[PDB]
Amino acid sequence: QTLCIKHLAKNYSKRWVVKDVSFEMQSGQIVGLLGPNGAGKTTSFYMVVGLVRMDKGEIHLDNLDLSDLAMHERARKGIGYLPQEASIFRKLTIAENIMAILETRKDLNKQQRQQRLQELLNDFKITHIKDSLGMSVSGGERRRAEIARALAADPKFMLLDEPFAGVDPISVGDIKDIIRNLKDRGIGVLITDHNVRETLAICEHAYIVSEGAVIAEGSPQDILENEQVRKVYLGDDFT
Amino acid sequence: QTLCIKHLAKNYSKRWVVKDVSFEMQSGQIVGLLGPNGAGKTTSFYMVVGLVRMDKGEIHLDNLDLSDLAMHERARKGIGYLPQEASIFRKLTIAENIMAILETRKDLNKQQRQQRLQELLNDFKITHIKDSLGMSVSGGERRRAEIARALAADPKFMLLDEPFAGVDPISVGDIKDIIRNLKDRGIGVLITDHNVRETLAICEHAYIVSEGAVIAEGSPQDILENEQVRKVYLGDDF
Amino acid sequence: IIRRYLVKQVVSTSLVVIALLTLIMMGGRLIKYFGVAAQGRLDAGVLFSIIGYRMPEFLTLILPLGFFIGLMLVFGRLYVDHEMAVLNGSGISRIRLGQLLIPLALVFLVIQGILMLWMTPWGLRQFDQLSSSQAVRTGFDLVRPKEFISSGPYTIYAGDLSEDRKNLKDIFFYQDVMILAKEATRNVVDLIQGRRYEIYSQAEFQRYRLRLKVEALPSSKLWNKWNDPVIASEMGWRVFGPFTIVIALMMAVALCEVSPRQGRYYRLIPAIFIFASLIVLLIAIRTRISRDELGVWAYPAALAVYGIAAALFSRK
Amino acid sequence: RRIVAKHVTKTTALAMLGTTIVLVILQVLFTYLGELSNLKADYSAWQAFLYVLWGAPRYLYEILPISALIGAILGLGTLASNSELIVMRSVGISLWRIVGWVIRSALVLVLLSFALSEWVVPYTNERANSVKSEVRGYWSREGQRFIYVDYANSQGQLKRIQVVDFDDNYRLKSVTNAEQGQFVKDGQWLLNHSQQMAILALQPKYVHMVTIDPEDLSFSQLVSFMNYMREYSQVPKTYQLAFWKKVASPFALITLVLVACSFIFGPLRQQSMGFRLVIALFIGLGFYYLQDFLGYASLVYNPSPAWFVLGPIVLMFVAGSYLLYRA
Numbered sequence A: 001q002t003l004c005i006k007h008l009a010k011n012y013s014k015r016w017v018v019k020d021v022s023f024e025m026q027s028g029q030i031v032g033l034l035g036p037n038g039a040g041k042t043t044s045f046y047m048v049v050g051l052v053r054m055d056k057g058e059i060h061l062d063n064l065d066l067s068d069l070a071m072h073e074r075a076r077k078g079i080g081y082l083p084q085e086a087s088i089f090r091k092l093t094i095a096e097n098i099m100a101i102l103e104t105r106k107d108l109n110k111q112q113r114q115q116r117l118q119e120l121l122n123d124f125k126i127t128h129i130k131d132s133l134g135m136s137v138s139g140g141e142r143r144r145a146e147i148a149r150a151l152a153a154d155p156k157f158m159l160l161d162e163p164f165a166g167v168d169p170i171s172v173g174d175i176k177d178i179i180r181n182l183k184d185r186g187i188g189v190l191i192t193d194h195n196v197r198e199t200l201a202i203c204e205h206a207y208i209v210s211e212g213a214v215i216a217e218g219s220p221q222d223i224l225e226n227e228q229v230r231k232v233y234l235g236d237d238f239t
Numbered sequence B: 001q002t003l004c005i006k007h008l009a010k011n012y013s014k015r016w017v018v019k020d021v022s023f024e025m026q027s028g029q030i031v032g033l034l035g036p037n038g039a040g041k042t043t044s045f046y047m048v049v050g051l052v053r054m055d056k057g058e059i060h061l062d063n064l065d066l067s068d069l070a071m072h073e074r075a076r077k078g079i080g081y082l083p084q085e086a087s088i089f090r091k092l093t094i095a096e097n098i099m100a101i102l103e104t105r106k107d108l109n110k111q112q113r114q115q116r117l118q119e120l121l122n123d124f125k126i127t128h129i130k131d132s133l134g135m136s137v138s139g140g141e142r143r144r145a146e147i148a149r150a151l152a153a154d155p156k157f158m159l160l161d162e163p164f165a166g167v168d169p170i171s172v173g174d175i176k177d178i179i180r181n182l183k184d185r186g187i188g189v190l191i192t193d194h195n196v197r198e199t200l201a202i203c204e205h206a207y208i209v210s211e212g213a214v215i216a217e218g219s220p221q222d223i224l225e226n227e228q229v230r231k232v233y234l235g236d237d238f
Numbered sequence C: 001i002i003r004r005y006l007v008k009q010v011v012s013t014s015l016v017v018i019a020l021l022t023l024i025m026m027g028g029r030l031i032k033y034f035g036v037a038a039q040g041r042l043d044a045g046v047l048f049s050i051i052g053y054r055m056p057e058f059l060t061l062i063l064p065l066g067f068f069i070g071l072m073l074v075f076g077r078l079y080v081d082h083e084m085a086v087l088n089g090s091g092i093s094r095i096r097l098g099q100l101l102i103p104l105a106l107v108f109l110v111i112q113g114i115l116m117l118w119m120t121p122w123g124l125r126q127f128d129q130l131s132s133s134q135a136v137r138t139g140f141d142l143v144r145p146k147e148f149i150s151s152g153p154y155t156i157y158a159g160d161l162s163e164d165r166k167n168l169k170d171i172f173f174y175q176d177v178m179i180l181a182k183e184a185t186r187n188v189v190d191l192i193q194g195r196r197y198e199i200y201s202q203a204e205f206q207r208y209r210l211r212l213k214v215e216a217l218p219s220s221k222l223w224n225k226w227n228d229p230v231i232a233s234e235m236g237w238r239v240f241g242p243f244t245i246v247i248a249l250m251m252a253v254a255l256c257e258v259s260p261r262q263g264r265y266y267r268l269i270p271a272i273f274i275f276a277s278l279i280v281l282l283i284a285i286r287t288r289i290s291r292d293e294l295g296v297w298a299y300p301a302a303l304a305v306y307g308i309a310a311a312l313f314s315r316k
Numbered sequence D: 001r002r003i004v005a006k007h008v009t010k011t012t013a014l015a016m017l018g019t020t021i022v023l024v025i026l027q028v029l030f031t032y033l034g035e036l037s038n039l040k041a042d043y044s045a046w047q048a049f050l051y052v053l054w055g056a057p058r059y060l061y062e063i064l065p066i067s068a069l070i071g072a073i074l075g076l077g078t079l080a081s082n083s084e085l086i087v088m089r090s091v092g093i094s095l096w097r098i099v100g101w102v103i104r105s106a107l108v109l110v111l112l113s114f115a116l117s118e119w120v121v122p123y124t125n126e127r128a129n130s131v132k133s134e135v136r137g138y139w140s141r142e143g144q145r146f147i148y149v150d151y152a153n154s155q156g157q158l159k160r161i162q163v164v165d166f167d168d169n170y171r172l173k174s175v176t177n178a179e180q181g182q183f184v185k186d187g188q189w190l191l192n193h194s195q196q197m198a199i200l201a202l203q204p205k206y207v208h209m210v211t212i213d214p215e216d217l218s219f220s221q222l223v224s225f226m227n228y229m230r231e232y233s234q235v236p237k238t239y240q241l242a243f244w245k246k247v248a249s250p251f252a253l254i255t256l257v258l259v260a261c262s263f264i265f266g267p268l269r270q271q272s273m274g275f276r277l278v279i280a281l282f283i284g285l286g287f288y289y290l291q292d293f294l295g296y297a298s299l300v301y302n303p304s305p306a307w308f309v310l311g312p313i314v315l316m317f318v319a320g321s322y323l324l325y326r327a
């Protein structure tokens, strides 16, 4: 499965924040939507998610158009969204957090819904907090619970917003391990983040968006050897 | 001139976020107050600024106690603060933004206040936007205007809150050059930031706060070879 | 789990908002009642009975408004706390949440139907009887200190008055019979150290004794008689009134899309104004039908216009 | 410091003026909606609209405290959410200096309230009453004398006078009656048919104020009329309450603005603009309800209305000062 996005466009008060952003992502790929801050990478990611309606654009998922579809319809088509901020249900426990999205699965019955919830809890090592509320867990545990809840919806493409945001370098490895699991389960993962250096360490195919247009495409090595990305975004020296 | 902080403490709903944070900074030094997120580095930095009052603590500025003083009193004593958010006056122009704080100076008259404003505008290359409103400037230009406005008050210790936040890697060099000119003016600079790796590249003396207590002290080279720091904060590979 | 989660949040916040709105509005009316009592035109010991009897009438408006505000608060919290992003990101639309809270809307509709059909008319008739009992007070009941009170053929002046409307001092009474007493206690009034004059007769004494709606009708009695425009208006109001709960549900689902930065309470005031506009339109239609100018058909039309507007806004 | 002060004062003043305009428009619309149900043959929709518009200055005078509160909340929330107050503190400007700037901004609304109370409300209220639609049966006491006139005018004429005299023993002395009367000088009135039984301080300037409620009276009229009583009779407690409510109106506005500033610097710091507006509305409703209830209670309880009127103001000022001390 592939998520083909072409010719994105959006203006804010007659100011085109995004101008012709086109990129392709396949299932089982960690594609990074990077670029200078405010250059349209965040807006492009949001229109891909469905939180910002496109002015001009075409979004496809295996020759199935999603441009006219709303965010929930796109999610039903197999697209997941992980907000950067705390998106956990405050008054629901972690097990209840996962089960609330699991109960919406039309192809799962309760007998196997319980098994899916148990294996999701065991996968992310959040079983010890299955009975604890979403507001009474640490940041890493809360993020793991959110990712398990998102996986409970069975998405084909998980769109991560700033996964490495406000996280210690010690837990950057844990987040990288998690986002490499999301690609071991087939879930294409689209990452937009300000922390580009550790984002490029997991991405298989990176996209750089400058002043609303995509200026680069390829593996992180190709981005790092580019003569324009290091001219507008990465700087002359970048390790 | 030194800014001595010792035995900071603060609790939130009977949860001690900060427990005995002590660090010293001198005028002319770029000291980094780092640590794992939510471990008390931000709360300690805020207590040093004066935004949140300290439950237990002692702050001194050249044998002058600032523990009982408020944020504005500490600022008048020679402490500067640069908020991470867009803190520019939206409806005041950049020249007006700097002049607004220059007028608060009691040792400057208007004849030399104009000269100080002109040289501050020329220093940070914001003269071309002197007549442009603060809400209609770019992020880098707005940050430079905010730093010039903070310097207009003539602080002895500039406390920067997340200077490398939402900044491109190409523009990190500009921020580093700016923070090194605040130290090349004699303005001790205290930096707290999640982006530790580019923070340690300018700091002369770094502090790591984990679970409310200071766990490290020394140059960034000493920090990077500290077992506890890379055991709880930096990780095995960094 | 998501349905019971949303129901719990909406019930809790709607109960909080209903209690807060009851306090605000009913105390604002109770303060006017207390001012009337302080002016002597109402008994201070019965204003709480008025509060009790007018509780159903105020709740008749607070319940839809409270439900609407609670729904707005819950959905704004979902949007602000990014819980709506993961709900939408899981295939659960906002309209899906509105449909999930349909049973709670039906429960509140049943509650407001109980209020409008039975509780509100009963409270209104009790309050009307109480007001008729309190509209007959006259004489020393309405006296105020250091002022002259004229009630029919009686002119009364009192130099002082206690915290309660008893134990008058420096009393001047006029009819023509003139009675001036140093003290008087309360119409049966016992005067102390007074002098009686007639205009010429004089009589001194140490003590003296002086002895000077369709909105409330039961729904059973108004179910028939649709031909009468007033009865028709009242019954249409009592029948189509409870559906404002459902209108509030589909309207707060429509007008709750708020960004995290704006906040949970950002869109409350415009949406509260829209709901109040709906209720004012309903009241105007009620008056128009009572004047035999619009007909009962306007109630479902008024509800359906706002419902269609809310549905179109929520599905744009 | 002038540019910071000018910026804060201008932003807060614009917020207060915008809130004032919005609230006046809303209360005119709501009053017209409430009056639209009271239409008759001689009171059409245009007549109701004219009555509401003529009452608009009175509505504005009633709003200005709440308008100033909400304006201070909105302006200081705009500054705080933009982190302008944070840098104002971080450069050496105290909380009390910003509060003083906001109070300087609200002094414009205080002056507007003074102007409306003295020169606009007394005339526009009369115009509104005339559009919707000098005292008969006036009963008055002057010391030990009770004076009743069935009809009096501002021009100085009396009809059906009835004056009854008394002593410390409350014994009848003279009951004089008349059919017509005229005013020539203070303390004496010429009249015909002087039927005096054997066993005046009325003034025609203050006749037109008898029908007017004490609250609706302007401060000049209220002070003169209370002085007239205190010279010739006992002033009612309602007039004292109205006087204490009018003299404490600018102080109430200033204290409410200070409370708004303290809330912005305190509990409402880092809150949403919508939440700040909702809390401002709640504080306005609470203050209006508290002042109305305590004004009503002053008329029923022994203590002077000054206590009941200056209680909320002093307590709110103390609470705001303490919240500002907590920074």
Ligand SMILES: CCCCCCCCCCCC(=O)O[C@@H](CCCCCCCCC)CC(=O)O[C@@H]1[C@@H](NC(=O)C[C@H](CCCCCCC)OC(=O)C[C@H](O)CCCCCCC)[C@H](OC[C@H]2O[C@H](OP(=O)(O)O)[C@H](NC(=O)C[C@@H](CCCCCCCC)OC(=O)CCCCCC)[C@@H](OC(=O)C[C@H](O)CCCCC)[C@@H]2O)O[C@H](CO[C@]2(C(=O)O)C[C@@H](O[C@]3(C(=O)O)C[C@@H](O)[C@@H](O)[C@@H]([C@H](O)CO)O3)[C@@H](O[C@]3(C(=O)O)C[C@@H](O[C@@H]4O[C@H](C(=O)O)[C@@H](O)[C@H](O)[C@H]4NC(C)=O)[C@@H](O)[C@@H]([C@H](O)CO)O3)[C@@H]([C@H](O)CO)O2)[C@H]1OP(=O)(O)O
Pocket: C024, C025, C026, C028, C029, C032, C036, C057, C058, C060, C061, C064, C241, C242, C244, C276, C279, C280, C282, C283, D023, D026, D027, D030, D031, D034, D038, D062, D063, D066, D281, D284, D285, D288
């Ligand atoms: C479908 C599902 C849902 C269904 C829902 C359906 C509805 C449910 C239903 C539930 C039940 C219900 O209803 O519940 C409520 C309603 C809920 C709201 C509506 C909701 C609708 C739905 C949509 C949401 C109760 C109600 O309705 O109560 C009215 C009362 N109304 C109000 O109080 C209005 C506002 C409501 C505001 C609504 C809009 C805003 C919110 C959306 O507050 C409240 O509701 C209380 C509370 O706080 C509300 C909080 C809300 C919070 C919301 C939060 C989300 C009424 O008050 C009279 C007047 O009071 C004030 O003005 P002033 O008086 O000081 O001048 C009021 N201003 C003020 O306070 C100023 C305050 C406003 C209030 C406080 C703030 C609120 C803020 C909210 C956000 O702002 C400020 O400060 C500034 C802002 C501060 C806050 C800022 C945040 C006046 O408001 C206005 O203008 C409008 C407001 O500004 C708008 C607000 C705008 C804010 C921006 C008011 O109109 O008095 C009425 C009775 O009154 C009578 C009676 O009949 O018994 C009649 C009176 O007479 C008059 C009249 O004056 O009206 C003149 C007559 O000529 C005639 O026309 C006559 C008549 O026309 C009949 O014809 O009316 C009067 O009579 C006497 C008197 O002496 O005075 C003798 C008279 O003499 C004789 O009269 C006889 C007669 O005619 O009877 C004649 O026969 C005789 O021949 C004649 N003989 C001679 C000799 O003359 C005469 O002399 C007269 C004269 O006036 C002189 O005094 O005086 C009175 C007496 O006082 C005793 O009270 O008695 C009550 O009704 P009830 O009791 O029946 O309940």
Ligand SMILES: CCCCCCCCCCCCO[C@@H]1O[C@H](CO)[C@@H](O[C@H]2O[C@H](CO)[C@@H](O)[C@H](O)[C@H]2O)[C@H](O)[C@H]1O
Pocket: C273, C276, C277, C278, C280, C281, C283, D030, D031, D033, D034, D035
């Ligand atoms: C669709 C039509 C246009 C809608 C416009 C937008 C409306 C927004 C909300 C308006 C709310 C105002 O609400 C209005 O408040 C007034 C206050 O004077 C109430 O009026 C109240 O006081 C008056 C004053 O005498 C009493 O006569 C009346 O019995 C009482 O209800 C009205 O009953 C209510 O309709």
